[PDB]
Symmetry: C2
Subunit: 205 residues, 2 copies
């Protein structure tokens, strides 16, 4: 089955940017629930239960009709949160090949940042903002709810391999930021883990 992953850090490691109370709730309650609900749906599907979550969400088309929504939502949630935790760290510097590719595809890092903040801010309701690689080009996309670009365009309205992303569900920012999602988005630049983004880019470029 799926399990709630251990984190790369203690819950307080992203202070003073992301609050430690939210980190703990978000991991132990929200993420745990997606794991639990995905596992419940996979119990009757032993041919699907063994797959890594990041692979199963690329294969939702192959599921029985009555399993597609619950696994989209809950396997999407598990995949997305697993990426999110790995994708946060203080003290990194955008550099190297990923920096150059961002400058190439967006014209500058600041142009990219403005585009990413706009996508993150304009996702109305629950969802995620992503930096993806499509082939050879980086792009900013957003998804609804627990959809992922790994699910493809038909399902999610987006596609590409997610280099990094930002959770814009209200549970991710309500305690510290209330409705001020733009303020939360600003703090994300202090904690986006460019080292992990760079490693993912190196594997896929």
């Amino acid at each position: 089955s799926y399990t709630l992953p251990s984190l790369p850090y203690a819950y307080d490691a992203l202070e003073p940017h992301f609050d430690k109370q939210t980190m703990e709730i978000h991991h132990t309650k929200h993420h745990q629930t997606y794991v639990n609900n995905a596992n419940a749906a996979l119990e009757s599907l032993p041919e699907f239960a063994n797959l890594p979550v990041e692979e199963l969400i690329t294969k939702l088309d192959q599921l029985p009709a009555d399993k597609k929504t619950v696994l989209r939502n809950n396997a999407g949630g598990h995949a997305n949160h697993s990426l999110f935790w790995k994708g946060l760290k203080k003290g990194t510097t955008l550099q190297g090949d990923l920096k150059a590719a961002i400058e190439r595809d967006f014209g500058s890092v600041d142009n990219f940042k403005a585009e990413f903040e706009k996508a993150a801010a304009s996702r109305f309701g629950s969802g995620w903002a992503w930096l993806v690689l499509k082939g050879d080009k980086l792009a900013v996309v957003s998804t609804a709810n627990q959809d992922s670009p790994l699910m493809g365009e038909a399902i999610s309205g987006a596609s590409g391999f997610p280099i990094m992303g930002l959770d814009v569900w209200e549970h991710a920012y309500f305690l510290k930021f209330q409705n001020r999602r733009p303020d939360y988005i600003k703090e994300f630049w202090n904690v986006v883990n460019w080292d992990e983004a760079a490693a993912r880019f190196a594997a896929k470029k």
Copy 2:
């Protein structure tokens, strides 16, 4: 211009069921933002800006194409929250004609409550659960984000005249209930304003 309506009650008037800190945030921050953002989008539209919000959300297809989404979202938000506040009150009982109509259409009050609880729990992501008068048979429906059944089926996936509704955006229940939406849904029965519901049912419109 739209304005933030004053509530019919103090922020603690729904205690011990809905918490007064959420009431205050939800009103003064979340609802205010929908007011503000809807007014910004309406300034260039004198022929829509001064209509009641409940009227506006019935003619979204009459807007310029570049205004449809922002006003669906923000006039929806203002309409829905305005209904919600008037749709909460302690010290009401489901009774009279409305009770009889629920029994007629659902078989029993408890069948209605179970169907409402199911719809409210199964709305994945942000949205609302509604009791509507849909060809004046009563029905339970849900909508995404700030959509309303007053917007019609093509836009919202639902239709009918709202009798009452429950906000299931995370901001409505995070502080007290965290991720435990079923517990929040249970508490709603202690605060839904059956007098306002009964008045809306009587009016039908």
